[PDB]
Ligand binder design. Sequence first.
Ligand SMILES: *c1ccc([N+](=O)[O-])cc1C(=O)N=C
Lengths: 10, 261
Amino acid sequence: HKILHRLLQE
Amino acid sequence: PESADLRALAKHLYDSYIKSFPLTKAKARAILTGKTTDKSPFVIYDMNSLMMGEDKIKKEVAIRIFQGCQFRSVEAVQEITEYAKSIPGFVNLDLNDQVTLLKYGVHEIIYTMLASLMNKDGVLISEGQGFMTREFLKSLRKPFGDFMEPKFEFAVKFNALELDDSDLAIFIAVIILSGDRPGLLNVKPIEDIQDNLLQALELQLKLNHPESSQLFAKLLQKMTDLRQIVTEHVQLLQVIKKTETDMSLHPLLQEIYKDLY
Ligand SMILES: *c1ccc([N+](=O)[O-])cc1C(=O)N=C
């Protein structure tokens, strides 16, 4: 879940 | 007393909700009613209207529509993830739970929110600038003609409950924090938060609709309808993902749908 992590990480 | 802490949470979430979502039920109704100072939406009732309408919006017709619908969902997921982050306690959870909570939550919330945008006849689009008819969407060729119809059916029942943006802000929080999604590592802290959110949601419904009773209970029955509606949908994506190779599914959407119901 690459983008989800990214979105959450932001 | 405690009703204070919960009154606060409800206002924090409404604030967060309004920052996060561009088009509220408030303006959407105003537009749909037409009782507003802004220019009316460009109605899209057929292929001709659509083509003329193309200029006022952000490959065969049906597949074009589905790609727009795709573009928009992705923006939805971003708005919802941003909102989730503002739920007190949400970001303290395991990052893998955060992902799971969202992975399963987002389609339930899209449909909750679509309904603010819908009526018996059709659905607002491009931030209230279009109004794409329900007749027109049915008319699309299989499988695409059955894609939006279950959501109109849900919408007509849900919009009856006459909920407010302030009610919805909490209602969507409660959905996201469902401790019973496949593959959570640590359920307890999620359930902890949901109990808060459910109390705040109960208070909010007593306060905002003091004449109406059982809106709370009615509303929690609908939370189960959605999971079914979302399953029915994921199934449809499999049907669409297979019978059409002409189309590509968006990476973010893939993430969600892969290993989902
Ligand atoms: C439209 C098109 C595609 C998808 N999807 O694959 O998840 C969802 C939607 C939708 O109903 N968006 C508002």
